[PDB]
Amino acid sequence: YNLLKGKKGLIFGALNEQSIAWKVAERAVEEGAEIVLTNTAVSIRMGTIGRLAEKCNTIVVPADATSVEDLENLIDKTMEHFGGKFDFMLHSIGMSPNVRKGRTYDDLDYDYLSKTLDISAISFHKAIQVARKKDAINDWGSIVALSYIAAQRTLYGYNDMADAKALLESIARSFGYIYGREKHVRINTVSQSPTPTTAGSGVLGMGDLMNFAENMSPLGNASANDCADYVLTLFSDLTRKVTMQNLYHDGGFASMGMSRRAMKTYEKGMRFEDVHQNQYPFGE
Amino acid sequence: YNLLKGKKGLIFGALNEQSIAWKVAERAVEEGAEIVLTNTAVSIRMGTIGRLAEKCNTIVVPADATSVEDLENLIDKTMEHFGGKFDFMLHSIGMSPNVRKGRTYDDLDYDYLSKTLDISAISFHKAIQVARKKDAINDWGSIVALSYIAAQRTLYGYNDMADAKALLESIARSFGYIYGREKHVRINTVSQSPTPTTAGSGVLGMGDLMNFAENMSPLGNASANDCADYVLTLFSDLTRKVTMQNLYHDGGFASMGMSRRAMKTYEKGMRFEDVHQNQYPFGE
Amino acid sequence: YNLLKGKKGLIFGALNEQSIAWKVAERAVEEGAEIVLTNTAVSIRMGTIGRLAEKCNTIVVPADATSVEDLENLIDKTMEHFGGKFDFMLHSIGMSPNVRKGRTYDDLDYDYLSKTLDISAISFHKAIQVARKKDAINDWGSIVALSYIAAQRTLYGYNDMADAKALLESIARSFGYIYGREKHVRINTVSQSPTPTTAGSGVLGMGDLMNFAENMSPLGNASANDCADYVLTLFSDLTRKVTMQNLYHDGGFASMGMSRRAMKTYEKGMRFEDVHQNQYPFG
Amino acid sequence: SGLVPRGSHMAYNLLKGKKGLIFGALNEQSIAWKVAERAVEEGAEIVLTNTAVSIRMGTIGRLAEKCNTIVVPADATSVEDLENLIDKTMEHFGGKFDFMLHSIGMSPNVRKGRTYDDLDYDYLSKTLDISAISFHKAIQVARKKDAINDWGSIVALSYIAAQRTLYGYNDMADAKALLESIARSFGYIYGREKHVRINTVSQSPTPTTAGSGVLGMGDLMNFAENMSPLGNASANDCADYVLTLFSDLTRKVTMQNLYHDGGFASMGMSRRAMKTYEKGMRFEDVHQNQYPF
Numbered sequence A, B: 001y002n003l004l005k006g007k008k009g010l011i012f013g014a015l016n017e018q019s020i021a022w023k024v025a026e027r028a029v030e031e032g033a034e035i036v037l038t039n040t041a042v043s044i045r046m047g048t049i050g051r052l053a054e055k056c057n058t059i060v061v062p063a064d065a066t067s068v069e070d071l072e073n074l075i076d077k078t079m080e081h082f083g084g085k086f087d088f089m090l091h092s093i094g095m096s097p098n099v100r101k102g103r104t105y106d107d108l109d110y111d112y113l114s115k116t117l118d119i120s121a122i123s124f125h126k127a128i129q130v131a132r133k134k135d136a137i138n139d140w141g142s143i144v145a146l147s148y149i150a151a152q153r154t155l156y157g158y159n160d161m162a163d164a165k166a167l168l169e170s171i172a173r174s175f176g177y178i179y180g181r182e183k184h185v186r187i188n189t190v191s192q193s194p195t196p197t198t199a200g201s202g203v204l205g206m207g208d209l210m211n212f213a214e215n216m217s218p219l220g221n222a223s224a225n226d227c228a229d230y231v232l233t234l235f236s237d238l239t240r241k242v243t244m245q246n247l248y249h250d251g252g253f254a255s256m257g258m259s260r261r262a263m264k265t266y267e268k269g270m271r272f273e274d275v276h277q278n279q280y281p282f283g284e
Numbered sequence C: 001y002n003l004l005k006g007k008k009g010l011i012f013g014a015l016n017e018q019s020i021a022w023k024v025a026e027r028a029v030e031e032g033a034e035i036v037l038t039n040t041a042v043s044i045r046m047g048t049i050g051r052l053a054e055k056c057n058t059i060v061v062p063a064d065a066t067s068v069e070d071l072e073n074l075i076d077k078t079m080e081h082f083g084g085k086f087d088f089m090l091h092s093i094g095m096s097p098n099v100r101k102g103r104t105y106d107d108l109d110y111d112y113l114s115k116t117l118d119i120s121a122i123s124f125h126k127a128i129q130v131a132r133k134k135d136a137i138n139d140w141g142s143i144v145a146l147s148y149i150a151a152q153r154t155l156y157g158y159n160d161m162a163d164a165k166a167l168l169e170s171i172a173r174s175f176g177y178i179y180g181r182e183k184h185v186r187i188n189t190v191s192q193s194p195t196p197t198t199a200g201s202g203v204l205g206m207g208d209l210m211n212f213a214e215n216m217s218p219l220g221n222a223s224a225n226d227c228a229d230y231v232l233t234l235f236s237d238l239t240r241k242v243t244m245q246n247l248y249h250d251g252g253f254a255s256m257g258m259s260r261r262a263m264k265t266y267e268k269g270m271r272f273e274d275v276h277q278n279q280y281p282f283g
Numbered sequence D: 001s002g003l004v005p006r007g008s009h010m011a012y013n014l015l016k017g018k019k020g021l022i023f024g025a026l027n028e029q030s031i032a033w034k035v036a037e038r039a040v041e042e043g044a045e046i047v048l049t050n051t052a053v054s055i056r057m058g059t060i061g062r063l064a065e066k067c068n069t070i071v072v073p074a075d076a077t078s079v080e081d082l083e084n085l086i087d088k089t090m091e092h093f094g095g096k097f098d099f100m101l102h103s104i105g106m107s108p109n110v111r112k113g114r115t116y117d118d119l120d121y122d123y124l125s126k127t128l129d130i131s132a133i134s135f136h137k138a139i140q141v142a143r144k145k146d147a148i149n150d151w152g153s154i155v156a157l158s159y160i161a162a163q164r165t166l167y168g169y170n171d172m173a174d175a176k177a178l179l180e181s182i183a184r185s186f187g188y189i190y191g192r193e194k195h196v197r198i199n200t201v202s203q204s205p206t207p208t209t210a211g212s213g214v215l216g217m218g219d220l221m222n223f224a225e226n227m228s229p230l231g232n233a234s235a236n237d238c239a240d241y242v243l244t245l246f247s248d249l250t251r252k253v254t255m256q257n258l259y260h261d262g263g264f265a266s267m268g269m270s271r272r273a274m275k276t277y278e279k280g281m282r283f284e285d286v287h288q289n290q291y292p293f
């Protein structure tokens, strides 16, 4: 569509070809954008962002998004790369040392929790505050962070990441009010389906949680590729009046109370009794 | 507790001893309130409200809550009975001819739908408008309607009643703004668990829907007795600053994304892996 | 962008060049869609939709969206025009006889309220039910209705239309579950800024309400043209996994509790004390 | 006009036989002070707690005397202090108790006049710890010691900045969003196990020590007042609402964020909030009572 022709952007969090940020990167460049990539020194070494950088004809700047100093260096190197200001920024970063080290929500380590909140939420505030201090972002620019419905409605096992996502979504509102009134920069969260990614694979019983979400979601779970398509609309000029929103991209999960497929009495091929026609939507 | 000592109220919708309004009536009188009861002529003949009125030492005034003329007579008869104004009013009325006659949501009769919205929602506006025109309600009075989470999140089978509840909840906001600023009268909805009542029994697959909600709700489903206890707090002086709220009374259902019990892989006695202690909350 | 190349759509409610539906129609055809237009016989005679049909190289099918018979005819004529099924549908319809006749929320006529709810909300269920019975909509198709935040939070004067919008948004969820699981058709509401349209000009003190929302919204109110741009995304393949959503398109109004500009004590030129830099965002 | 009528004593014995732990009573203006007084009038036994510094600078000693109980010093960010607090509370009651009020909030960023676009991130860490994580710390310690009876009730105080942005409210808005999530996360666990309910009360802007620290609090309270059809809720009003949540009557209410704000949370635009409105202007949205004030 050439949706982002002439646009420049900074993308965090592309680890491997499964990463939501990897798909956003590829699609942004396919749609005419120029991008800069960033990840931690460890993720650069252990994943395949080098191949993405090659495909997108750009550079990878190492940064820890919890380090104001690293973020300052990143914005300088990004603005140097572009020869000035850029239009869009994707925060696609999440990690809990509690989840990683198998600490349960009722037995948290509070030093771990501090890192969960810093990596998964405060990093967004740190990126925006540094970018804004350096005036890195053009008027009518677009900032997105990826979030999850555990921020609003509890999911068994999701642990301290649920609370981190509630904090992340609040920062989008808090900083969105400031950046919008000044420079018409919109800031939104995209609340994505459970998705098969490195960070996703660390969620307790993720395969079973994904099946639950699939059964609840009338359109089924959104893929990482689907998410990239949606994020492209938020980077495009067509969403210039959308700000401070938490935007569910989940095939309807957020709006569902009880699907037929989620019921324990349901088996595939049972007749749907809530409709007069198409009573076998998943076949006989 | 004598929570409603000196208070006078009008209770709609007591059909039989299963009715949420029946429990609210019993409990209101136990807590020192004087009440007036109303139902349709047909429901008075077909149900047991006569026995409740005997227990509560009061009158039953026949009224169709879709009839402004019946509501005018009801308010006159209520104020005559009390010798003037009263403090609280319970709307506990719901019916869909589409649900009763097995019309599905994709095959509605639109005359039936008009009646669903009239009985289940517009009757609330009619009751408040007629009461307020006759200045029937004391300053710092309390008006409650009973609603259901389908108003926000879709449940398989719930049909046109979901849309009616969304409409009912909006009327509580719209009229609450007016009655609050004028006479400090609070207007709220209580969003109750799925409950075994005459109206509840008409819901598609209600037993299985109740089972789903019970698995999703950490405290379990609320009974009609539990709901009456909660409604008593809204009629009491202790909630005088709570208005235009939709209050979930549901053992946590509204705030749950996915419980362990709701998962198809779960069986009774399986160890919970989201906690360090009490891993068998439902026994081994 | 060619965002809607090869797509076909039915657009309700284009009255005149200020209508949100008029802007959606222009922008849909600019983006490569083919459309069919509809409005009431009265609106076709009193408005300028004929001019839009000419610019969009298409037909105007008369229909009362409260009439199942008229919707059945409309969907037949639309499918005949396209030679089969279509991809998107815009519901852009609202009217309150209570508001029009100066009846206040505390003194409703209940026959007028029944018409408000029919025109403003039930018409959306009627359109979807008829279309679905005729299998009118392609898999991965997109249905949008225009709504307003009065559905969630009370605005002085907005009257029975607030209640109608809550009902409208519920229909999107109820029907969205069914059409989604069957044919992957998404159904969403766009909750738009107060906008200077014919319907908008009927709102009690619309000018003052629009100024309140402008001051509360950090990006400012969304225009009808801005709204048309957003609706384009929902008809595009890029939003295929977005359904049963009420989507605030309002420059941030829905997420604001209190802006500096909303405060009685604020005057244009006062220093913003909540930031370290850009303390004069409005000069 | 919005001042709720009081005078005659309300004695409902709502909390007769119940035992509670109350955080955050600094002085007679504190919401937690009102909750403590009202809980004892309704028949409860309480234990009080605050920081060493707050105990020394404030008047909690007076409250402790009125409520015939002890003040246990504790920094609610310290797991060790909370472990001590829960042991001293259970020793005082001779076992488990029924309710706990978290009424704690402070931002070093707000106190030091650091703005949201120029946060100190060590200060932010402390805002989040004091204002939100402390609630997790208190529930985790209490639950590990099985301190709370079946059908018990835990409440924390929050503010609508958690959902809708208010000019100047700063990093406390984000802290309140985190606090309300902890209520849901821990409510699921404590509910399913022992039917212990956990809720937040989202209160009006209130003239307290912590409240007076909010940038232009006077002007924010006036905006909320004009936007709230019943007017702002007082600390006394909030205490009355919290009593219902500690009472048996709310046993099926959990993981809720409960707005106690005279309707502020459900309002889009009040007539009073509009710049064109002056006292005594006719309301045109109604046919009757067009001069409601």
Ligand SMILES: NC(=O)C1=CN([C@@H]2O[C@H](COP(=O)(O)OP(=O)(O)OC[C@H]3O[C@@H](n4cnc5c(N)ncnc54)[C@H](O)[C@@H]3O)[C@@H](O)[C@H]2O)C=CC1
Residues within 6 Å of the ligand: A012, A013, A014, A015, A016, A018, A019, A020, A021, A039, A040, A043, A063, A064, A065, A066, A091, A092, A093, A094, A095, A119, A146, A147, A148, A191, A192, A193, A194, A195, A196, A197, A198, A199, A200, A201
């Ligand atoms: N996979 C899922 O189910 C869902 C994921 N999300 C969110 O999407 C975002 C991206 O994650 P995914 O693509 O799923 O997984 P991923 O594992 O591909 O990406 C996570 C990224 O976070 C980066 N990261 C970790 N710590 C960092 C630090 N200190 N500084 C900078 N970067 C750091 C990692 O290097 C990695 O590139 C996360 O916020 C995640 O929570 C949201 C909803 C669902």
Ligand SMILES: NC(=O)C1=CN([C@@H]2O[C@H](COP(=O)(O)OP(=O)(O)OC[C@H]3O[C@@H](n4cnc5c(N)ncnc54)[C@H](O)[C@@H]3O)[C@@H](O)[C@H]2O)C=CC1
Residues within 6 Å of the ligand: B012, B013, B014, B015, B016, B018, B019, B020, B021, B039, B040, B043, B063, B064, B065, B066, B091, B092, B093, B094, B095, B119, B146, B147, B148, B191, B192, B193, B194, B195, B196, B197, B198, B199, B200, B201
């Ligand atoms: N049972 C459930 O699962 C739930 C019920 N509710 C609501 O609680 C309210 C009370 O219903 P329940 O006690 O469950 O059932 P119920 O069958 O005991 O009460 C329904 C009442 O509505 C009355 N009614 C019907 N048409 C009427 C008319 N035209 N005018 C006046 N009254 C009329 C009936 O006579 C009956 O007394 C209803 O609004 C229902 O939707 C809310 C949440 C869940």
Ligand SMILES: NC(=O)C1=CN([C@@H]2O[C@H](COP(=O)(O)OP(=O)(O)OC[C@H]3O[C@@H](n4cnc5c(N)ncnc54)[C@H](O)[C@@H]3O)[C@@H](O)[C@H]2O)C=CC1
Residues within 6 Å of the ligand: C012, C013, C014, C015, C016, C018, C019, C020, C021, C039, C040, C043, C063, C064, C065, C066, C091, C092, C093, C094, C095, C119, C123, C146, C147, C148, C191, C192, C193, C194, C195, C196, C197, C198, C199, C200, C201
């Ligand atoms: N103007 C505003 O401030 C806002 C408007 N909206 C909504 O946008 C939609 C379109 O209205 P606007 O473009 O603002 O005004 P408009 O006056 O340009 O369009 C309203 C349309 O509804 C049509 N209509 C009325 N009765 C009808 C019937 N029985 N059948 C079929 N069509 C009928 C009219 O003919 C007209 O074309 C409405 O739902 C409105 O409530 C939503 C948010 C804000």
Ligand SMILES: NC(=O)C1=CN([C@@H]2O[C@H](COP(=O)(O)OP(=O)(O)OC[C@H]3O[C@@H](n4cnc5c(N)ncnc54)[C@H](O)[C@@H]3O)[C@@H](O)[C@H]2O)C=CC1
Residues within 6 Å of the ligand: D023, D024, D025, D026, D027, D029, D030, D031, D032, D050, D051, D054, D074, D075, D076, D077, D102, D103, D104, D105, D106, D130, D157, D158, D159, D202, D203, D204, D205, D206, D207, D208, D209, D210, D211
């Ligand atoms: N006043 C207002 O406008 C509103 C206040 N709230 C909340 O109500 C709660 C109570 O505050 P208020 O009664 O308004 O003010 P307050 O100043 O009377 O109470 C705040 C309390 O927090 C305590 N505290 C501070 N740091 C602590 C620590 N490390 N450990 C233990 N305690 C500590 C203070 O000693 C004090 O007792 C707070 O969570 C506040 O944010 C909620 C909504 C509105």
Ligand SMILES: [Cl-]
Residues within 6 Å of the ligand: A215, A218, A259, A260, A261, A262, C181
């Ligand atoms: Cl399903």
